Amino acid sequence: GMDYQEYQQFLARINTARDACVAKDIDVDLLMARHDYFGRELCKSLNIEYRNDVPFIDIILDIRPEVDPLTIDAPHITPDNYLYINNVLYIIDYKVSVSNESSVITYDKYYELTRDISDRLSIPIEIVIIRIDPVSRDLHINSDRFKELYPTIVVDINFNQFFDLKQLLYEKFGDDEEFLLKVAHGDFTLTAPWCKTGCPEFWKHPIYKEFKMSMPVPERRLFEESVKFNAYESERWNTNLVKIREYTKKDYSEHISKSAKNIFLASGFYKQPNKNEISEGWTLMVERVQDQREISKSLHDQKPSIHFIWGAHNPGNSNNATFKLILLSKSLQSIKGISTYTEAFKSLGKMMDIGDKAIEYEEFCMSLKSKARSSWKQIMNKKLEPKQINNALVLWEQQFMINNDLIDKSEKLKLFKNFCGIGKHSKPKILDFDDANMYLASLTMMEQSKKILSKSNGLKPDNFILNEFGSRIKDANKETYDNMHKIFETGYWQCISDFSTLMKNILSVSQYNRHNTFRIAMCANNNVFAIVFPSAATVVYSIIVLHKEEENIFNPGCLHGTFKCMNGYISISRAIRLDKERCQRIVSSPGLFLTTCLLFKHDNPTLVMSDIMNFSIYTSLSITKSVLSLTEPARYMIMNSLAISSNVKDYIAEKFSPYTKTLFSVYMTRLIKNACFDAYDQRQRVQLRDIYLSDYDITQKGIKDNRELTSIWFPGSVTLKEYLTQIYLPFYFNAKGLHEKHHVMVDLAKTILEIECEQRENIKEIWSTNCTKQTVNLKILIHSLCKNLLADTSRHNHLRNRIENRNNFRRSITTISTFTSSKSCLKIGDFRKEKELQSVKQKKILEVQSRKMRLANPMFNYEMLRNAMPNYTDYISTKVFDRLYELLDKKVLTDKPVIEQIMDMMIDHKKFYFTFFNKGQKTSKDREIFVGEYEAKMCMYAVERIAKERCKLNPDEMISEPGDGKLKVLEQKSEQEIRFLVETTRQKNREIDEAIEALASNLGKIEKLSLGKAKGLKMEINADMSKWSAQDVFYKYFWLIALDPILYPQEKERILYFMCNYMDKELILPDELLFNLLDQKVAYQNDIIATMTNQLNSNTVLIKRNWLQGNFNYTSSYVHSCAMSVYKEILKEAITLLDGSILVNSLVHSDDNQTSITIVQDKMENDKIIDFAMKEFERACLTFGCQANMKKTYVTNCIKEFVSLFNLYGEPFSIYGRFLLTSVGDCAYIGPYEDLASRISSAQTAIKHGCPPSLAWVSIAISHWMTSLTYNMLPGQSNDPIDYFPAENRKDIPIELNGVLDAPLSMISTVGLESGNLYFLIKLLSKYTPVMQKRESVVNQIAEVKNWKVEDLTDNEIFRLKILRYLVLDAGRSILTPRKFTTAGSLRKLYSFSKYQDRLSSPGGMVELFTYLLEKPELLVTKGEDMKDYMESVIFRYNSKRFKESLSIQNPAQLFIEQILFSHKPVIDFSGIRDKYINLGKVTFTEAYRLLMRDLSSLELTNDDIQVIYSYIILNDPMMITIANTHILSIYGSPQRRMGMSCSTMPEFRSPALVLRAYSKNNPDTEMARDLVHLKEFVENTNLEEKMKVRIAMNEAEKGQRDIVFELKEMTRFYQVCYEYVKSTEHKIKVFILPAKSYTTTDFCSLMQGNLIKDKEWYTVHYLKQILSGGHKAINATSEQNIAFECFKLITHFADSFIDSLSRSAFLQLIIDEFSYKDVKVSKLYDIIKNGYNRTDFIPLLFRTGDLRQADLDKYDAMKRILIRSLDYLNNDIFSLSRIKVGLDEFATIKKAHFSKMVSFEGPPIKTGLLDLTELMKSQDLLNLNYDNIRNSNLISFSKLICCEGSDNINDGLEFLSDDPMNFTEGEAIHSTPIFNIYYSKRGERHMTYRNAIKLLIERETKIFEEAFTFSENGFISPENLGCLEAVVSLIKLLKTNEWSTVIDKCIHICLIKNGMDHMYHSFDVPKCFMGNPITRDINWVMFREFINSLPGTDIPPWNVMTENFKKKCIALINSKFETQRDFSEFTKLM
RNA sequence: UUAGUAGUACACUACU
Ligand SMILES: [Zn+2]
């Protein structure tokens, strides 16, 4: 990026400097260094000459020197650069800054002065100031004339390297306040106050009394003093803040020492995990569980592991519906024996008989299905009636009627009372997992499963996934394709998939399942069936299977019993009562399952594939809560047990509680138990990779991947990365929303009331010194607040200004999202009236639904609560957008500034109320959400937001960093430590290491000195705080508001009052919880809920110290940061004692914490400091009121846990798996494209977090599978659109119609779904383009499109383009989307929806809205900027029936079934499809394909229509421009192993609602005026201004009068398509893990491309031309130049690196003339360099050719006193093209380029004795700049570099190679606790030249070739063998020159030239033996043939296989020559 | 709103 020379000198100046005024100048010099750097590279980007601080009076003299500068008055300014074209002078003053505030100042200053001579000379002078952003990198130019000149400018600039120097300078001097004084943009500017008057009540409040009670009396007054302090009044802002700092400095200075001095007190005794410590924990766990749960040893109490019973399919019987129905009927009737429900199952088969009348079932059912398939809506009013067939009364296809005559009254009861459990109505029941005869039973269940499921399907291993994605999986990694087959083949896959396909059909049936009906559900298996019994939503089902022989059935613990029938055996499973939410997951279980297996097995050959799948079905299908209780606690139980410092005992003895209800759970528990002990013995089995560090980051970082560790869930060995996956991944198998709300509300309530009681009874004291639970070290707090509050205001002065802007404090409440959102909200008051009326309605609807059930199968309160509970404070649920509307209409909210309204609300609202609703997430331990009043939301907003922008300043806080941005931060901080550790070790041990190499004589004396030295120590505290919210003093936060400098006194009074009320805040127990406790039935022994509510009197309990979970994150997080800031100071004083160095780095995120400590020792042992660090860690937490959970907290020597994002020893790594398990049931079930959109987004996310392409593609397959399974769009399904459309396969069917996503992953990762459309257009620009222009930019290939011929194209090719233009372009672009008939639902709670009723009811008032909205069309798309505007927007919104539904929650489970059932019904309205073709009702999916073709065939494809596609898609979006370029200019290079992974940021490829108001009326309300100009162009170029008006203007003559509906609906479309153009998208933080650091776009592109090709090897990427094009106005000049630079940089270095010094000019001269780099002649590139204005870059090149003149030297010398003859003399002994002396010791620079580019050279061969330097250029292996790599290289690699034309003495011929020394890589151990070797590049000695390397290679490798090709006991001598050699090398020329043969020839050649036998080799033709007659050149193939067989061969590596293949090839080939398949008639003609 | 009466409608259908 930047120059290396200036970096080194600026780094040294930071250490050299001591005083702040010296450090000041280093910051000033760094600005100019960046200033010129931007200018140097931009001048080449614009092709102009570079200049610096050139006077304006001289700039005119270049244009017109006839008038002298004295008489003509020119403005005396100092511009940077100038240009004169088109009779206009353009003045340049480039500058790099974040804001244009510094640019407009210099703009108007220049514009004013330049006008003095602008009218004097009558030549207009334009000011062109170019500014670039130093982080986001965006170009900003003010000149409009300059915009039209340069359409696109190349800006791949690097500031990343500049900020590295800034970090160093603001580290040493950043602590000193003398340096902070010098950096200022106003010193300190405090903005306008948010309030006018203070708060008197705050000083009176009893909580403020209680605050000062505990506090000491000097502190009491200080708090008074601090609040009343105004920062704007006193001379400086830090008057008070420093004053209170200096008071507490007595106790602080002492307490910092106190903690630090404990380093000597410590011992080598810390909570370390050990086999016994784990064992002890388990035993106390057993005791706990055996009390807390009812332990059972009986095998009848178990629950099903899986809720399914699979049995082998029967191919002998027919696979057809009607047949199976009767088959199961007779089968069920035929059941023989006696049980409980035997005669019940018997009659059920009897009630589904058809027999003779099989054909009547085929018709009757098809009529009913056809009746429903006609209508969009369901068939209402008409009564469904059954038809008597044999004994059964069929109601629908596979639906029957329960006939009360066919079953006994007693036998009907048995089935429903006992078996189905309809009418059945104290510890939990669990299985003893410590019983070996229970663990046995559990193991035998697995042994049983493996015995049956391992057996193959025997059916074709070809399903949609493999059929359509197999190709794209296989090419990524062939292993995974096979792995997939291995699964699909095995009964495992058929078992799950048939349960999936069966459940889909169980749900589909269960929807219309009545109370007098039992339904039958069949699957792809013709033995497996299911019976769905009447449900009293709840699905009641049994799996009924007809397995072959007895016990050829899989029972996981689900089966009721097997039964013998009259033909075979039939088994019926226990009645399962599951919920649709659970069942859904079972349907998507195969996708979950495949991923599980593939992820585990991936690239690990030691694992048993049949054992992975054996475990996987029991996970992917496990829907019980038994499993979650294992999967979650395991993650910590393993990691704790393999960490260094960690408390396992306590975690296993308290936090671990198995709920082993099922039988898999028992087996899985013991898998975990065992895995805990294996960890302890593997702690030291972890190794640390050899770190190849050579300045600016490291490649080959992180942990060593060694397969020495042991797996957890199955047998085999595993890698660390894989071990971690096996540890953490299990938890993501867990299922969401399993927690029954009835139980959650109780346990959530109980906990809050338990911890509040704790505080009420036990915790009384607030502050303390000894450090105790819920206590803060008040003196230490106040100081550490003061110190940080200073540094978080000194580093940014406008801090109060930044808060106002970024959080919209000044603007009206109606603008901020958090307030105008559709989130849940709590309303307080009295609703006893409507709450009673809303309840009794449902209590009647209860009886309504019961009355109807009494007729068919006779099986069978809010008033009470209010009457019973006296002190019941009444509340209600509402919406956040609705509350705002309510508070405005009743006028308490206004257009007053939101903060100004907040301040008043803090003092107005005095009592705060909060309610909780459960999340019920995948975790077994349930999480609560506290949601209270809207009034509260406003208060917390300010307090939290003020802390937000404060927290952002501190780099330690990470809640500030949105998205997965933390991952890179982990890395950047880990790398800083790995570097520091090395740097510091080399700085101390250098004195000792010198003596070691000196003596190494006797080695017995060396060990004495090698012991007594410095010792490295790294450690990471992977923390997790205990009860961050509940067990935390809220009183401490009062001080943060008090001490605050950027808060006014009248604000400070008001903030603290609200917080004073947030102590007397009440928790409302929601009614649903109170209803559970309403019906007593004997109360709880010790009822905590009743205790706190006084035997249930009030529904409110007061919560004090427990500030509610998530309400004060940032606030608490700043105090956390302040706490860890102390921990730093503690250790940093402790390590100065021992005399060494320490680097502590703390990452803070509310409750999740990570703190990395790196120490270089001298005195005491490493293990002492380990215990010391942990002591002060808890101390640091507890001195601030927070307590650290030592249970979950673990410490490693590498690993970093932080928010579950993991960084290893530099190498960042997340659990790629967790995101692949999302693409299964994560969608809103809207449409085929709409579903896939989010399912592929989940796959895109995996790639970010370092996922292999092979597995990435799997998710893409699964996603498609589920997507197509939802709407019956799979191959062979109903809506299968391959026959309906013209196409070969689903790759060619548009993804809008649902097909497959045919694109490269490197595109899908970037854009996705749209990629599939983009690839179909790039395919064309690689088919329908000529030989010229195709190799050039994409832009050029788009110009040729309008010169194509339409007739050339094919049916499919035409088909895409027609939809792509007439449909896709304008309409998340979908065409097919099913519409529903859903109802609005109950919207009574809403106030705002009532005001729509009143405006709809009263006549005229409706139209009045729409007529008002037409004069303000800004309020159709965006919400109002003012009260009325926002309010009336809310009412209009209700117009949409979709927005009315949006505020109601539909179950995705129910939504899923509704898209299956409504697929054969008319759902897609064609009206909205045909409208576009023209500019009936709903249409069925099948008909939608037909009716699309009837319209499509009519449309016309032109040479223009196609050119609109290539404009609107490619040429419009600068991103799509580059993506297409990257895939056309792509040149994939060297395949390499993924050694070093690094984090990389996604690059850039680039007023809202107020602008649209200035479009409605052209007058705005200055910068916003300029924004409308480009908006005018957008609407005029597309011409959508007229197109919209014409569409309305001709509709009023179509309809008749004035339709207000069309007046708006068409006007809204016009404003919504504006929104996307006007309101710009925020470039959110996206981090991709790549094989190296991506600085700029091009770098990112190359590394991204190469990461998503193969799994085993990543590839480095090249490009012919620049890929970064900006549009279709910008059509090469800037793409050419850089090629010339690359070329000559490459050549000069290749020449001075490898070619002999003596003959380097000749080489260059030969290369320049007859050669070409990247299809451009090197001469033309040289001419481009010579005609350029940066010749100073290529001084040594120009001198060597004789194209260097004095002007260049004079310029070069002026950039950073010379003569030509001086150079001519000086460089008489320096022979290099990359370097010439331009002084006494100053050499010239050529700037080295990478050597992976030399392949892009194409010229005639240059032969040098024997070597062909062209082939050395074209070589891959022999281009490394490492001596050892080339010395220890293969002869196969070198054998390409030989021609020799009969040379001699190989030693002589190698004279044309560099006899200059090469660079070797040396490595050394670092002497850390995690001991690793650093490897770096040295310069070797002298005898390490390129020649000697080649020679040593030749010698070593030829010796091995000789002994392999002896074929006798002689050698490479003895003509008896030379004859054999001649024979073997003869055939090689008379056969076929493939690739294997030629190598042998050239190797033999080499070997014979070496031995001095190259005076005959060239005169070696076929011997006399083989040649019958010498003259008559006849060949005896038979002889030759038998000669090849008669060759013995050798088995020495590496030639053993080489020779073997050669022989076979040559034999086969020879035999081929003979074998000529002649025509049968041919010979019959000749003779 | 309130009450009474009569109703409430459909997927897989496979190499198995
Ligand atoms: Zn030769």
mmCIF file with all atom_site columns, C-alpha atoms in Angstrom, chain A residues 189-289:
data_model
loop_
_atom_site.group_PDB
_atom_site.id
_atom_site.type_symbol
_atom_site.label_atom_id
_atom_site.label_alt_id
_atom_site.label_comp_id
_atom_site.label_asym_id
_atom_site.label_entity_id
_atom_site.label_seq_id
_atom_site.pdbx_PDB_ins_code
_atom_site.Cartn_x
_atom_site.Cartn_y
_atom_site.Cartn_z
_atom_site.occupancy
_atom_site.B_iso_or_equiv
_atom_site.pdbx_formal_charge
_atom_site.auth_seq_id
_atom_site.auth_comp_id
_atom_site.auth_asym_id
_atom_site.auth_atom_id
_atom_site.pdbx_PDB_model_num
ATOM 1   C CA . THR A 1 189 ? -18.259 23.009  22.268 1.00 0.00 ? 189 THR A CA 1
ATOM 2   C CA . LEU A 1 190 ? -21.362 22.228  24.447 1.00 0.00 ? 190 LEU A CA 1
ATOM 3   C CA . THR A 1 191 ? -24.641 22.585  22.408 1.00 0.00 ? 191 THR A CA 1
ATOM 4   C CA . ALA A 1 192 ? -28.136 23.888  23.470 1.00 0.00 ? 192 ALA A CA 1
ATOM 5   C CA . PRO A 1 193 ? -29.741 22.502  26.695 1.00 0.00 ? 193 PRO A CA 1
ATOM 6   C CA . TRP A 1 194 ? -32.686 19.990  26.396 1.00 0.00 ? 194 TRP A CA 1
ATOM 7   C CA . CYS A 1 195 ? -34.482 21.521  29.472 1.00 0.00 ? 195 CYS A CA 1
ATOM 8   C CA . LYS A 1 196 ? -35.267 25.045  30.894 1.00 0.00 ? 196 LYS A CA 1
ATOM 9   C CA . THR A 1 197 ? -36.106 24.243  34.613 1.00 0.00 ? 197 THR A CA 1
ATOM 10  C CA . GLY A 1 198 ? -34.709 21.645  37.112 1.00 0.00 ? 198 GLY A CA 1
ATOM 11  C CA . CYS A 1 199 ? -36.482 19.157  39.485 1.00 0.00 ? 199 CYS A CA 1
ATOM 12  C CA . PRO A 1 200 ? -37.232 20.047  43.157 1.00 0.00 ? 200 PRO A CA 1
ATOM 13  C CA . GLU A 1 201 ? -38.937 16.647  43.963 1.00 0.00 ? 201 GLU A CA 1
ATOM 14  C CA . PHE A 1 202 ? -35.595 14.803  43.232 1.00 0.00 ? 202 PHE A CA 1
ATOM 15  C CA . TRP A 1 203 ? -33.919 16.290  46.403 1.00 0.00 ? 203 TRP A CA 1
ATOM 16  C CA . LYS A 1 204 ? -37.097 15.355  48.439 1.00 0.00 ? 204 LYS A CA 1
ATOM 17  C CA . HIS A 1 205 ? -37.423 11.722  47.087 1.00 0.00 ? 205 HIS A CA 1
ATOM 18  C CA . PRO A 1 206 ? -36.943 9.006   49.800 1.00 0.00 ? 206 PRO A CA 1
ATOM 19  C CA . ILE A 1 207 ? -34.608 7.016   47.424 1.00 0.00 ? 207 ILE A CA 1
ATOM 20  C CA . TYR A 1 208 ? -32.291 10.117  47.261 1.00 0.00 ? 208 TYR A CA 1
ATOM 21  C CA . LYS A 1 209 ? -32.530 10.125  51.118 1.00 0.00 ? 209 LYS A CA 1
ATOM 22  C CA . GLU A 1 210 ? -31.725 6.332   51.155 1.00 0.00 ? 210 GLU A CA 1
ATOM 23  C CA . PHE A 1 211 ? -28.796 7.061   48.705 1.00 0.00 ? 211 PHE A CA 1
ATOM 24  C CA . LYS A 1 212 ? -27.068 9.558   51.111 1.00 0.00 ? 212 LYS A CA 1
ATOM 25  C CA . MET A 1 213 ? -27.870 7.418   54.255 1.00 0.00 ? 213 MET A CA 1
ATOM 26  C CA . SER A 1 214 ? -25.071 4.880   53.416 1.00 0.00 ? 214 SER A CA 1
ATOM 27  C CA . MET A 1 215 ? -22.766 7.435   51.605 1.00 0.00 ? 215 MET A CA 1
ATOM 28  C CA . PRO A 1 216 ? -20.182 9.319   53.760 1.00 0.00 ? 216 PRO A CA 1
ATOM 29  C CA . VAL A 1 217 ? -20.770 13.043  54.615 1.00 0.00 ? 217 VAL A CA 1
ATOM 30  C CA . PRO A 1 218 ? -17.826 14.445  52.523 1.00 0.00 ? 218 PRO A CA 1
ATOM 31  C CA . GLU A 1 219 ? -19.252 12.441  49.518 1.00 0.00 ? 219 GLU A CA 1
ATOM 32  C CA . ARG A 1 220 ? -22.854 13.613  50.352 1.00 0.00 ? 220 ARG A CA 1
ATOM 33  C CA . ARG A 1 221 ? -21.854 17.299  49.669 1.00 0.00 ? 221 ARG A CA 1
ATOM 34  C CA . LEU A 1 222 ? -19.664 16.298  46.620 1.00 0.00 ? 222 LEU A CA 1
ATOM 35  C CA . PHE A 1 223 ? -22.817 14.718  45.014 1.00 0.00 ? 223 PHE A CA 1
ATOM 36  C CA . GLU A 1 224 ? -24.741 18.022  45.653 1.00 0.00 ? 224 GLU A CA 1
ATOM 37  C CA . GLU A 1 225 ? -21.722 19.971  44.212 1.00 0.00 ? 225 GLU A CA 1
ATOM 38  C CA . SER A 1 226 ? -21.425 17.696  41.079 1.00 0.00 ? 226 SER A CA 1
ATOM 39  C CA . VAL A 1 227 ? -25.177 17.939  40.079 1.00 0.00 ? 227 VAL A CA 1
ATOM 40  C CA . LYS A 1 228 ? -25.313 21.801  40.355 1.00 0.00 ? 228 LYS A CA 1
ATOM 41  C CA . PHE A 1 229 ? -21.979 22.189  38.391 1.00 0.00 ? 229 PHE A CA 1
ATOM 42  C CA . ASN A 1 230 ? -22.450 23.704  34.862 1.00 0.00 ? 230 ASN A CA 1
ATOM 43  C CA . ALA A 1 231 ? -19.529 22.841  32.470 1.00 0.00 ? 231 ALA A CA 1
ATOM 44  C CA . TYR A 1 232 ? -20.371 25.792  30.091 1.00 0.00 ? 232 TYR A CA 1
ATOM 45  C CA . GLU A 1 233 ? -20.142 28.345  33.014 1.00 0.00 ? 233 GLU A CA 1
ATOM 46  C CA . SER A 1 234 ? -16.640 27.602  34.524 1.00 0.00 ? 234 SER A CA 1
ATOM 47  C CA . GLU A 1 235 ? -13.485 28.394  32.394 1.00 0.00 ? 235 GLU A CA 1
ATOM 48  C CA . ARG A 1 236 ? -12.925 24.638  31.605 1.00 0.00 ? 236 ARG A CA 1
ATOM 49  C CA . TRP A 1 237 ? -15.492 21.739  31.430 1.00 0.00 ? 237 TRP A CA 1
ATOM 50  C CA . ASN A 1 238 ? -13.267 19.423  33.602 1.00 0.00 ? 238 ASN A CA 1
ATOM 51  C CA . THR A 1 239 ? -13.361 21.769  36.693 1.00 0.00 ? 239 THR A CA 1
ATOM 52  C CA . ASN A 1 240 ? -15.551 19.480  38.926 1.00 0.00 ? 240 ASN A CA 1
ATOM 53  C CA . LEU A 1 241 ? -14.597 16.149  37.214 1.00 0.00 ? 241 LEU A CA 1
ATOM 54  C CA . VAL A 1 242 ? -10.834 16.711  38.034 1.00 0.00 ? 242 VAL A CA 1
ATOM 55  C CA . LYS A 1 243 ? -11.675 18.285  41.476 1.00 0.00 ? 243 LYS A CA 1
ATOM 56  C CA . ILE A 1 244 ? -13.530 15.097  42.687 1.00 0.00 ? 244 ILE A CA 1
ATOM 57  C CA . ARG A 1 245 ? -10.798 12.928  40.977 1.00 0.00 ? 245 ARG A CA 1
ATOM 58  C CA . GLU A 1 246 ? -8.033  14.475  43.209 1.00 0.00 ? 246 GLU A CA 1
ATOM 59  C CA . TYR A 1 247 ? -10.081 13.866  46.468 1.00 0.00 ? 247 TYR A CA 1
ATOM 60  C CA . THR A 1 248 ? -10.542 10.050  46.009 1.00 0.00 ? 248 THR A CA 1
ATOM 61  C CA . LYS A 1 249 ? -6.877  9.736   44.732 1.00 0.00 ? 249 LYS A CA 1
ATOM 62  C CA . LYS A 1 250 ? -5.763  8.919   48.357 1.00 0.00 ? 250 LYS A CA 1
ATOM 63  C CA . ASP A 1 251 ? -7.732  5.594   48.691 1.00 0.00 ? 251 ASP A CA 1
ATOM 64  C CA . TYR A 1 252 ? -7.493  4.774   44.907 1.00 0.00 ? 252 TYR A CA 1
ATOM 65  C CA . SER A 1 253 ? -3.618  4.987   44.767 1.00 0.00 ? 253 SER A CA 1
ATOM 66  C CA . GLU A 1 254 ? -3.598  2.708   47.898 1.00 0.00 ? 254 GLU A CA 1
ATOM 67  C CA . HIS A 1 255 ? -6.256  0.186   46.601 1.00 0.00 ? 255 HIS A CA 1
ATOM 68  C CA . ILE A 1 256 ? -4.460  -0.077  43.164 1.00 0.00 ? 256 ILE A CA 1
ATOM 69  C CA . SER A 1 257 ? -1.260  -0.998  45.147 1.00 0.00 ? 257 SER A CA 1
ATOM 70  C CA . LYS A 1 258 ? -3.238  -3.228  47.635 1.00 0.00 ? 258 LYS A CA 1
ATOM 71  C CA . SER A 1 259 ? -4.485  -5.522  44.774 1.00 0.00 ? 259 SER A CA 1
ATOM 72  C CA . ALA A 1 260 ? -1.169  -5.307  42.778 1.00 0.00 ? 260 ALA A CA 1
ATOM 73  C CA . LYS A 1 261 ? 1.061   -6.363  45.770 1.00 0.00 ? 261 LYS A CA 1
ATOM 74  C CA . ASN A 1 262 ? -0.999  -9.643  46.043 1.00 0.00 ? 262 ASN A CA 1
ATOM 75  C CA . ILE A 1 263 ? 1.286   -11.006 43.196 1.00 0.00 ? 263 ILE A CA 1
ATOM 76  C CA . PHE A 1 264 ? 3.760   -12.233 45.932 1.00 0.00 ? 264 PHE A CA 1
ATOM 77  C CA . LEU A 1 265 ? 0.908   -13.467 48.250 1.00 0.00 ? 265 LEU A CA 1
ATOM 78  C CA . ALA A 1 266 ? -0.389  -15.869 45.505 1.00 0.00 ? 266 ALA A CA 1
ATOM 79  C CA . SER A 1 267 ? 0.602   -19.594 45.145 1.00 0.00 ? 267 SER A CA 1
ATOM 80  C CA . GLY A 1 268 ? 0.367   -22.201 42.300 1.00 0.00 ? 268 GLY A CA 1
ATOM 81  C CA . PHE A 1 269 ? -3.095  -23.251 43.687 1.00 0.00 ? 269 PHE A CA 1
ATOM 82  C CA . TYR A 1 270 ? -6.042  -22.220 41.391 1.00 0.00 ? 270 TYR A CA 1
ATOM 83  C CA . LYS A 1 271 ? -9.362  -24.034 40.554 1.00 0.00 ? 271 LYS A CA 1
ATOM 84  C CA . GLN A 1 272 ? -7.870  -26.390 37.875 1.00 0.00 ? 272 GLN A CA 1
ATOM 85  C CA . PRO A 1 273 ? -10.063 -29.192 36.384 1.00 0.00 ? 273 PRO A CA 1
ATOM 86  C CA . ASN A 1 274 ? -8.911  -32.766 37.364 1.00 0.00 ? 274 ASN A CA 1
ATOM 87  C CA . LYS A 1 275 ? -10.453 -36.293 36.940 1.00 0.00 ? 275 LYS A CA 1
ATOM 88  C CA . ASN A 1 276 ? -11.339 -36.505 40.708 1.00 0.00 ? 276 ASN A CA 1
ATOM 89  C CA . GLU A 1 277 ? -12.722 -32.887 40.856 1.00 0.00 ? 277 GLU A CA 1
ATOM 90  C CA . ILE A 1 278 ? -15.130 -33.814 37.957 1.00 0.00 ? 278 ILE A CA 1
ATOM 91  C CA . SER A 1 279 ? -16.051 -37.232 39.559 1.00 0.00 ? 279 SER A CA 1
ATOM 92  C CA . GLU A 1 280 ? -16.859 -35.509 42.933 1.00 0.00 ? 280 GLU A CA 1
ATOM 93  C CA . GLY A 1 281 ? -19.189 -32.986 41.164 1.00 0.00 ? 281 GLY A CA 1
ATOM 94  C CA . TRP A 1 282 ? -21.108 -35.805 39.356 1.00 0.00 ? 282 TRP A CA 1
ATOM 95  C CA . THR A 1 283 ? -21.765 -37.666 42.689 1.00 0.00 ? 283 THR A CA 1
ATOM 96  C CA . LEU A 1 284 ? -23.301 -34.525 44.360 1.00 0.00 ? 284 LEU A CA 1
ATOM 97  C CA . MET A 1 285 ? -25.308 -34.071 41.075 1.00 0.00 ? 285 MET A CA 1
ATOM 98  C CA . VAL A 1 286 ? -26.690 -37.672 41.482 1.00 0.00 ? 286 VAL A CA 1
ATOM 99  C CA . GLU A 1 287 ? -27.691 -36.881 45.148 1.00 0.00 ? 287 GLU A CA 1
ATOM 100 C CA . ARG A 1 288 ? -29.399 -33.609 43.953 1.00 0.00 ? 288 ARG A CA 1
ATOM 101 C CA . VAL A 1 289 ? -31.276 -35.222 40.970 1.00 0.00 ? 289 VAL A CA 1
#
